[PDB]
Structure formats: C-alpha cells, structure tokens
Design a binder for these strands. Structure first.
Ligand SMILES: [Mg+2]
Ligand SMILES: [Mg+2]
Ligand SMILES: [Mg+2]
Ligand SMILES: [Mg+2]
Ligand SMILES: [Mg+2]
Ligand SMILES: [Mg+2]
Ligand SMILES: [Mg+2]
Ligand SMILES: [Mg+2]
Ligand SMILES: [Mg+2]
Ligand SMILES: [Mg+2]
Ligand SMILES: [Mg+2]
Ligand SMILES: [Mg+2]
Ligand SMILES: [Mg+2]
Ligand SMILES: [Mg+2]
Ligand SMILES: [Mg+2]
Ligand SMILES: [Zn+2]
Lengths: 110, 26, 204, 97, 50, 166
RNA sequence: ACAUGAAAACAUUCUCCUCCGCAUAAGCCUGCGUCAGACACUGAACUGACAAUUAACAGCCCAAUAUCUACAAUCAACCAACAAGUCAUUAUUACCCUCACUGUCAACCCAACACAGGCAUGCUCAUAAGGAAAGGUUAAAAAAAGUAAAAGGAACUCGGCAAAUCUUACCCCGCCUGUUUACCAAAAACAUCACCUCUAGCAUCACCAGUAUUAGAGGCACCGCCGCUCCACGAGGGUUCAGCUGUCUCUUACUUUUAACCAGUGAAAUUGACCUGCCCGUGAAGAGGCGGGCAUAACACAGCAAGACGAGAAGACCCUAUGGAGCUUUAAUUUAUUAAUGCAAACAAC
RNA sequence: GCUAAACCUAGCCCCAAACCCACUCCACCUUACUACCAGACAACCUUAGCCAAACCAUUUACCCAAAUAAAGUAUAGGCGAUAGAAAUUGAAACCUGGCGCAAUAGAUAUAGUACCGCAAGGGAAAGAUGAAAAAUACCAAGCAUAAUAUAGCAAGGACUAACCCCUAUACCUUCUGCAUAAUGAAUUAACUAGAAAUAACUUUGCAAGGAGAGCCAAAGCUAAGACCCCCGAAACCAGACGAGCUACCUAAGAACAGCUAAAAGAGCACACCCGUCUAUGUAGCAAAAUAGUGGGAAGAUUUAUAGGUAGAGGCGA
C-alpha cells in the first residue's frame, strides 16, 4: 500500500514531538562516595569498576606468567602479595603471586 | 548572471527597507 | 614545469609547499589582466633603489629584492609592509614581523643616484654599442646593480673540490681536427684489431 | 534566489567617439555625388547579404547558390537540411492557405 | 554518486619560508635585550631620594 | 555556507555604568559536520534545553544514544572557555538557553536493489548549536491555576461590546 | 532492510560447521605486505610513501631436396567386435656457436555490489586444510521452516497438493530413446530406427577425394497382420486396491527466523492542496468535502484490511486511424534477377 | 541560524580577410606502437527510402561554379501534386566587424576525458575571496527557533477577541454536462512553444505618371506598419558493428565412483547435466534465485580452447 497524500509538517510535528517520544529525565543519578564520579543507584560506579578490572588484569597477567602453560590449573588456593609483604600464618601451602606494586588502600588485606 | 540594472536596483532598495525595519534608527 | 593555462603567480614560488596549497591543480580562478611589457622596455632589476609613488608611506626610497615579470610586480624590502603572526600554534600566540606587499611598476619610479628624486628613464646605446638606460632629465649612466646570483656561487671565494676540474686542464685544448670519427680514433688508440668486414644489408 | 545581491558595475558610453560622431555620413552620396555611387555599395558584411533582404528560407538559397561551394562539409550538410525543413514548413504548414 | 568532499587539507603553520630564495623576511627589531640590566635593590627608596 | 554562530562570540558591548544591573554572560558554541542525523540529535538537544550545565552533563552521561557523548564534550569545552575567556566566575553557574541541530552537508550514495533497481541513499551530517547563560536556570512556568481561568473568563465577558451598531 | 560464536593475561582456550580445501589453466592487474595520515583508536578491504614475484616449472623451437608410414585402443594375453581409430622413417647435401628473452604478488574472474548465481582440470573423499548461523533483550498477534499428538484415517480438496508411507491394477495418447518454447507450455508436440514417394549416369573447395546396395528432397513413425493389434517405456492425461499420515473432523504444544523494544547505518513505490467523522437524501447515475440530521478535548504505539472506484507498465478486453508489420494467395503492377528456347550479331561452343 | 543564496570570467557563435598542419632519438599493418628471412594479396561499378500528392503502383525541389533582370515566363507533369529553363542583360567593394552568448547560455567539451557498451557507438557533470594568503547583515524550497484543543477546499464577511457565528462543491484539460470516484500536477529554482506580406487596410512621397535599368498603370506607382506554434509513435531505406550469450558446424582435447548385469542410445545410484511439482522469494541472494522433491547420468552424454556461418541474412531433432 502506498500513501495517498503527502503528510504536512504540522502533522509530523505533532507526531515527532509527542511527549512519549521525548527522552525521559532520569532521577536515579547520584555521586559516588569514593571517587566523586556520577553513578546510578543500581549500577556499579564506572570509575571504581574499571580500576578494579585493571588491577585484576595485571594480577591475571602475573597469574599466566607464573602459570606458563594451558591446562595447568593449580589445585591449591591463591593469594596475591604486594611489595614489602610476607606470607601470613594462615597463608601456607597456597600459590603466591608477587605484584611489583604497593597494595591499594581499597584492597584490604585479610 | 542576467544582464540588466533596473531589477537589481529595485532589489537593493527593498533590502535596505528590510535593513531599516530590522533595526530602526533612534 | 607543470602550470595550468590560467595559473596565477603569487609571492610563493611555483612548486613550493605554499604555492601548491594555495593553487591546487583543479583550481580555476579568473585570470588577472596585466599590461604587457616587452623585455627591452622593462627597466626594473633586483638591487636597484626605487622611489615608491603611491602607498601608505609615500616619498620613501628602497631597494627591490624580488621582481615578478608575469604580474609586473616589484617587491621592495622594508617598504609597503603589513604585519602578520609567524609560528602560530594552538599553544603559542605567534611572532609578529612585518611582511612586504607587491607593488606595480607604475606605482613606483626609478630614482637618480646623484639626485634623490624620481626620474623618467629611456633606453639608449653607448659609444661602443652596449645598451644602457638614460634618464629624461639630467641624463647619465645608471648601470645594472650588482646582485647575488641565483645559484649562490661566489667566484671570488671559490675553492676547487676533489671532483672539480682545474682551470688549466679544462681550458687547455687537445682536439686536433681530422676526418675520423670517435669510434675509429678510440679503436686505434686502444689497439683493438677487427679483421672481419661488415657485409652489405638491405635497407627499407 | 534568482537575483543578484549587488549592483552591476556602471557602464560608461562615449557618445562622441569616432563611430558615433560620424554615423550616417556619406549615406546621401548618390543624391549629392551625381549618382556615381549607391548607398547599397556602402554595405559591409556577408557576401550574400549586401543590399538584399529576405526571409530565412530565401537567405538559405542565396547563401547556397553564391558561396555554397566554399562552405565546410558539415556546414553544407546542415544548410541542405535547413533548406529541406524550411521548404516543408512554409509550403505545407500554417494557419492560412 | 561518487562525489565526495574536497578534504585534502594538510596542517600548515607559518614556520619557514621555502629555502634557496633570495628574498628573505626583513626584521625591524630584535627579539630581546642584548644585555640584561639587573635593577639594584631598594630603587623604590632611591625614588624617594630624588 | 553560514558560520554566524562562531562570530556571535566576538561581539563586545560598551562598558556599563554602575546604575544599570549586571549583564549576564552568554557564550555561543557549535560543532560542525557531525556524523549524525539532525532529527535524532534534535531529541537530545530538546532534552537538555533549559537545564543547568552540570545537570545536563549528568543526563547526557548515562544516555545510550551516540549523540549524547558528542554534546557532552561540546558542553564541556563550552564551559571551559566560558570561565577561561568569558569572565565567568563560577563554572557551575550556567544554564542552557538554546540547543538545536541543523542539517549539515551530506553525500549521495547508491543503494543497490533487486531486479537491477537502485535507490539514492544519503550520508547525513548535522551541526549542533548551544548557548550558555551565566546564572541559575529560570524557574519553569507554573501550571495555570483555576483562579487564573476564572479571571480570564471574566475578562472576556467584560470585554464584549454591542456590535454592528453606534 | 543490514551485523559481530564465547570467555579471557587479548598470550590463549572453548563450542559449532564444512557440499569444502590446495594447486594449475583462463581471467584480472598490486586490489587486507610495512610506515604515516554496523563498528573502529592498533583506526582499515580509504589516501600518501616504501617494499616486492629471481628458473630447473611454463612460454618462446625445427636447414634443404627427394623418399617412406596396410595390421587400433581397451592390464592386450585370452575372446569378442564395429562406429574402423589418438601417436614410426630413410638417402644425400649443409652443419660444430650454446643457457638469451618473457610469465611467477594478492583475500583476485563474469554477473551495476565485499551479489545465497555462473565458472575447466589434477589431488584430498574428510580432512593435516578452510570457516562462524546469534549486536543486546523480550518470548504478543501475524507470516515462514521444523518436531511431537488422543480417537478416526482422504470424511480435506478441482485433484491424496503437501506430508507420511515406500502399494496393486486398468484405460487413453505417444513404439522405445532423445529434443524444444533461455524467463508462465517438457507434452499427445518434434526428431527417431523401420517403411513409402520424388529427382540424379557423374570429377579436382559443399554433395565427394563419393558413384543406383549411392546421393539429395520429402511423408509416415519400430515390429506384425489385412485399416487394425501387440511387447517394453513415459516427471504425459484419467481411475482404482491396500497402506500411510494434522489433508481433514479440530486443532494443540514446543524450537528457529521474521516479530516488538534498546544502540548504529539507513532505501522504494507514492504524494493537487487538506484543519481527512457517521446515517439518510442528492448528484457525471457508487460522497470524508453538497443538503437535512447525529457524533465530536488534544495526542503517540501495536494490530486489522471495509473504503479512499488504494498503488504499480497510457495493462488486458471491443471500436477508429484513407497508422504499421508478419504470413498466405487464382489481390493489383512488374521481370529488373536466374534458368530454358527462338531471332539477330559473331564463326559447334562462348 | 543551517542545508544555502548571489558573482565574471573561462570560452564560444556568426562574418570579413587570408588558401592549412604533419621526420629530437626509439617503436609502431604480426596480438599496432613488437630490432633481424623466398613473396606474389589488390582499388574503380546508377544510391535507396522516409516524405507530398490527405491511400498509393506514377511523379515529388536538393550549390555546380555572375548577383539582379528576363521569370515562376516558355516548357514538363496519374497535364495533378508539383517541377522548371535558355537566348539576352550585367557587380560592387574603404576587416582591424557585432541593437551575438556569459557556466541549465554559447561548440559536447575543464573532454571526446570520466562513465556505459564485446564491438560499431553513446557520452557527461563542474569554476567563483583579496592589491597582497611571504595578510586565513538581509533572499526560493526544506528545516530549526516555536507540536497539538470540537467543525470540515481551510477563505471571506467580520469582531474587543486566533478559534467559536454566517456564507462558500480546489486548478487545468477533455466532453452537451466534471466537487466529481475522467487526465495531468510532492514542492522550489532555471529553461521550455506563432516563423511568411498574394490581396486588402492604415500612413508618407510623387502623380497621368510611379520606381536608383527590368515592373506596373483607364489614379496609379514606390516605401513602411501589420497575420500563419511545441513535444510524442509503431515504421521505411542506405552504410557500418556483432556467433566471448545462444543455434549449428570444424580442428584437436577432457570427464563419467560404486552395485546388478551384460560386450545393452540396460537398471539402481555419486560427480555432472537438466528443471516435473510444492513452498519461499516478487525493488528478492537473483532483470528467473533458494530449499525439498524429481528426469538423465557409457551416451543422439557432458564440457574447456581455437575457428566458421550476419540481418533482403544465419541457424533451427
Ligand atoms: Mg544484476
Ligand atoms: Mg525489521
Ligand atoms: Mg536481532
Ligand atoms: Mg492423530
Ligand atoms: Mg471427497
Ligand atoms: Mg506428492
Ligand atoms: Mg525421456
Ligand atoms: Mg519457458
Ligand atoms: Mg510426431
Ligand atoms: Mg533502530
Ligand atoms: Mg496507410
Ligand atoms: Mg506508409
Ligand atoms: Mg559408472
Ligand atoms: Mg542407460
Ligand atoms: Mg506439468
Ligand atoms: Zn566511584
């Protein structure tokens, strides 16, 4: 089926500028208590999630380098250690990962 | 470009009238 | 030498980076009408002091540094100069230095070296037939000013290099005219002997 | 759109140049010269358009009959086609008979 | 259809005019003072002692 | 082409005598030749229209549309030169006055169809304009109350005359 | 309307597919090598610059004059053939210098495109090689594909079309076999062995390097009987037995794709202007626009196809044009053309 | 305020005058632009048709070499549409031109390039600053600024007041008659269509004469003014270009697993060739395809390369 007559700009304005066609204002936006960047109430903060992933990626890079080959998953627990750190009394018989960095403040040690 | 002068002259007066109406002098 | 038929000459030399950007191969602008001046009639040369007639600072004399015969343009160093910013970047404001503007051969007039006043000049021959330019009023000889040659060579301070032929060897003559070609003279010089003869072929 | 936004450059006409100041001179040479010359002989222009007038069809035959042998091959072909079309239009078409 | 823009622009500043040219930019003034003059300390008090 | 928006930042007003109040600062900024539809960008421009600069940035940051990040950078650089070059004291004391989109220069390409047919597709480009005015955003117009309807109806009844007579 | 399998240290690993892959020829001509300047920063199948494919493979050959060359191939041995075949020399003279030139890349060719099409040969017969159907979400209608189903089993329907199952018999037509309307007809149409009719007594480009058992032009369509039957066969047209099944009684459930929402890119037909309601009447005879009544804040999304005599090719169908074209002929006007005779010319022919 | 809008040159047309170009080197008729072998190979021959006579068979103007005049006369002609002489008469001359065009114009031309077509062939679009770039304001349409409030060819009469009241059946064209549900138009800009002086009329000059040889005249003769459109077929003929698709043929090549059988234009069944039926698709992946189901598949089979048959024709189970 083809249009019978050309739709006027007045009709198009009534349709395109309809209230439901407009973008609704979001009221679930708040500042992150830690870094001060905007975040949603139910969504993790972009700044803090991304900085955790980069540290996780660095540790995982150290994981593979110490691993040195696929299909060699260890059968023991793993604990990451930073500069100026020693194995704990409960940290025995578990794989040790050495990070050439200072332990982050948010990375609380158990 | 169309050769002629009267039409361009008439148009110039019309634009100046619009310019006068756009911001009338004190 | 790749120039469009209606190429416009500018301050930048043709083929330069600025000229290529200003005048792309696809550009087609209106040609600029220039009064034709014969080679013999032109009397403006580099290094000549010229008194400018019409300008923002009239009555001043200066030496022409560049001449453009295609547009009858004379550029005088330090005269008729506007201002522009050099080295403009997103972080630096730029360096302000003057820059000259073209002047027509009719906007300027040659000056008498002995009398600081513009004069009209005509071309006249000397006693030996060498061509010079003689002014209309208080006629005298105003020769072509000595100017640095384009290649930048200075014979007065030239030193021969390891691959430069000496003057005596270059100028001495060894050619003895005769009825022999280059090939046979060289062949007998090296002692090459060719007993076999060249048999006749058909040419068409 | 369709009109210039600036005034055209003014035009200067010399009403007293050589051609204008002496237009029409010698047009009465026959009357005042004992009829030794005709004003038609003063006509300067095409060979087939000297002291003669006619419609478009008549101008085509006159050009073909007098300078047709000297025309270019393409021009002669176009002239022949023009005569054929003009002959058909004038002798077979029109409101009046 | 094949028509496109004229996006052939190359970034160009004003640094060096083409070399091997007789014409060169004429400078009217120097960049900075030839010799730096260090003002003596206490010249404000010397102003009072005219 | 026309580039009047850029020149709107070069107009200078004469110095103001102490008698007259403070003239609020205004900044005209625009980004040209954005690979986006002007109709699609219109919705984002209307959304942030009339709101504060920082509230607009928060709304644009979490919007999924591609044009949202383009306007977000445009608003950010508009706020920068406002404080730096336009004598704006507080960078958060700004509100959006007008935001709109205009059609840019577009190319024409061929879209192939079946049976040897074709259709002329268009690579749409658009500009985005924004003006920032120093000061808190003006309050929105309150809804017209019932008493306002009452007086208006009375005024119409009181403004009627005897027509087609003396 | 179009897309990118998954996780991740972006090292790698995992899931799935191959009816593809490699090479050669043909074709094309630097067209995902390096550096720099839907998606895209390293962005890149875009632009600028630089780099490259090295001959043994292949292409590019042959002194002259005479003179030789009956016996296949098919493991070639048996056997059995017809359609009778795809490969050989010698005599004499002449003759002794040698490794030149070109092809060599790629994700590539013809299809207007990075097109589900077309495309020769040798290997691999499932890969040792080559690839990814899902951008994300929801699981409405409607549409497409697939699977399952109580009881019955063609009652559906022009028709057992489809699907399931893996059946039998009969009639009509055409011997079989093959061929055609490339793009609406694959047949009963055409060719076809066999049979019948007509014409021809013969050299040096067809017939034919042949000669009445031959050749050419045709009709019919084998065989057999004295116009008619008979085997076999047919994606040909009808009928039937049994079985089979969602064809149906009477539909239901599930899966995938389209679908709807979110983000990116983004067409086409169509469009006099529209502020585009219902009933009855009227009217160029079928009214949203005229008359009389009724209804009536504005506004988007998803469906529906009654109307807008809806849209798409001056459609098809009948009439006109002192408009065309194809075919036929005892339509009209001709023999210029060819052949055969007569006369003249020329000395039996030309 | 955005897509935009404006510009003056590039150059071209018609005349006058005057008779034009074609070997740096090297390569270039073979597959052109390819250094270097025994040949014989040759050009010349009435144009037709559309069209007009309202069909048509007959006929139908096409520079032929001095303008004018004789003259549209003598003649020719289905004596009709139309064609059309000669004798005789005899012409002037001083470019340095334009009441020609100005980027949808003027040559197609920025170029016979890009691009399409096997080939012959067809064939474009466009540029805009300034003395210096070694100085880098207002205007079509469409939108935005600024969506919408009962009711209706959207307007008019009005009114304090946008609407509310009353009145009013869009334009052109074709027909007796169209709001018509008969055609055409989405909108804007530019371009786009009435050509001729026989007679007659009007106005000057002269006048039984007019006219700058010829012609007319029983008030006429000379001069001037003023009337006759655009696009569109199916067709006909002449000369070239096409058999890389397809029809057929020639040369010399290649392919056909396995099983049953038998030395089969045999059977089942891959590769491969074909395309019976259904569904999907219908501007699609595709100007004929995909999925499934089918026929053939050692033969009148399929297929790669090179060559031949060309339109008054070829080829054709
Ligand atoms: Mg195609
Ligand atoms: Mg969709
Ligand atoms: Mg999806
Ligand atoms: Mg059942
Ligand atoms: Mg039944
Ligand atoms: Mg079936
Ligand atoms: Mg068959
Ligand atoms: Mg067919
Ligand atoms: Mg038959
Ligand atoms: Mg979308
Ligand atoms: Mg007829
Ligand atoms: Mg006819
Ligand atoms: Mg087999
Ligand atoms: Mg068989
Ligand atoms: Mg059928
Ligand atoms: Zn945070």
């Amino acid at each position: 089926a083809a249009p019978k007559n050309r739709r006027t700009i007045e009709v198009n304005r009534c349709r395109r500028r309809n209230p439901q066609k407009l973008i609704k204002v979001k009221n679930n936006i708040d500042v992150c208590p830690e870094c001060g960047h905007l975040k949603q109430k139910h969504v993790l903060c972009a700044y803090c999630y991304e900085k955790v992933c980069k540290e996780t990626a660095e540790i995982r890079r150290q994981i593979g380098k110490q691993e040195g080959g696929p299909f060699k998953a260890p059968t023991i627990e793993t604990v990451v250690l930073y500069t100026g750190e020693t194995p704990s009394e409960q940290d025995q018989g578990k794989r040790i990962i050495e990070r050439d960095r200072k332990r982050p403040s948010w990375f609380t040690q158990n | 470009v169309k050769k002629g002068f009267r039409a361009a002259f008439r148009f110039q007066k019309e634009l100046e009238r619009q310019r006068l109406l756009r911001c009338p002098p004190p | 030498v790749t120039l469009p038929p209606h190429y416009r000459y500018g301050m930048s030399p043709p083929g330069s980076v600025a000229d290529k950007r200003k005048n792309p191969p696809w550009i087609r602008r209106r040609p600029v009408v220039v009064e034709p001046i014969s080679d013999e009639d032109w009397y403006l040369f580099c290094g000549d002091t010229v008194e400018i007639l019409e300008g923002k600072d009239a009555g001043k004399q200066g030496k022409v540094v560049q001449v453009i015969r295609q547009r009858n343009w004379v550029v005088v160093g330090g005269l008729n100069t506007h201002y522009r910013y050099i080295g403009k970047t997103m972080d630096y404001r730029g360096t302000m230095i003057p820059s000259e503007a073209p002047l027509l051969h009719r906007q300027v007039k040659l000056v008498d070296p002995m009398d600081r006043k513009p004069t009209e000049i005509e071309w006249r021959f000397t006693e030996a037939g060498e061509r010079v330019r003689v002014s209309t009023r208080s006629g005298r000889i105003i020769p072509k000013p000595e100017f640095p040659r384009a290649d930048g060579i200075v014979p007065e301070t030239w030193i021969d290099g390891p691959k430069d032929t000496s003057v005596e060897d270059a100028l001495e003559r060894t050619y003895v005219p005769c009825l022999k070609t280059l090939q046979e003279e060289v062949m007998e010089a090296m002692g090459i002997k060719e007993t076999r003869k060249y048999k006749k072929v058909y040419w068409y | 759109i369709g009109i210039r936004l600036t005034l055209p450059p003014p035009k200067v006409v010399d009403r007293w140049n050589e051609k204008r100041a002496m237009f029409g001179v010698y047009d009465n040479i026959g009357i005042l010269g004992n009829f030794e010359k005709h004003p038609k002989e003063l006509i300067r222009g095409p060979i087939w358009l000297r002291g003669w007038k006619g419609n478009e069809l008549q101008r085509c035959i006159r050009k073909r009959k007098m300078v047709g042998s000297r025309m270019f091959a393409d021009d002669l072909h176009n002239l022949n086609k023009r005569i054929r079309y003009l002959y058909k239009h004038f002798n077979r078409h029109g409101k009046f008979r | 259809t094949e028509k496109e823009f004229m996006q052939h622009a190359r970034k160009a500043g004003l640094v060096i005019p083409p070399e091997k040219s007789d014409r060169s930019i004429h400078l009217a003034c120097t960049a900075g003072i030839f010799d730096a003059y260090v003002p003596p300390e206490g010249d404000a008090r010397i102003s009072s002692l005219s | 082409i026309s580039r009047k928006w850029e020149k709107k930042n070069k107009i200078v007003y004469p110095p103001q005598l102490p008698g007259e109040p403070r003239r609020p600062a205004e900044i005209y900024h625009c980004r040209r030749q954005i690979k986006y539809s002007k109709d699609k960008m219109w919705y984002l421009a209307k959304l942030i229209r009339g709101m504060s600069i920082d509230q607009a940035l928060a709304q644009l940051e979490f919007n999924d549309k591609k044009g949202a990040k383009i306007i977000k950078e445009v608003l950010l650089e508009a706020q920068d030169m406002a404080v730096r070059d336009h004598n704006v004291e507080f960078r958060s004391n700004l509100y959006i006055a007008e935001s709109t989109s205009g059609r840019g220069q577009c190319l024409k390409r061929i879209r192939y169809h079946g049976r040897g047919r074709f259709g002329i597709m268009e690579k749409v480009y658009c500009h985005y304009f924004v003006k920032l005015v120093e000061g808190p955003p003006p309050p929105p117009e309150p809804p017209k109350t019932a008493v306002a309807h009452a007086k208006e109806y009375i005024q119409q009844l009181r403004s009627r005359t005897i027509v087609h007579t003396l």
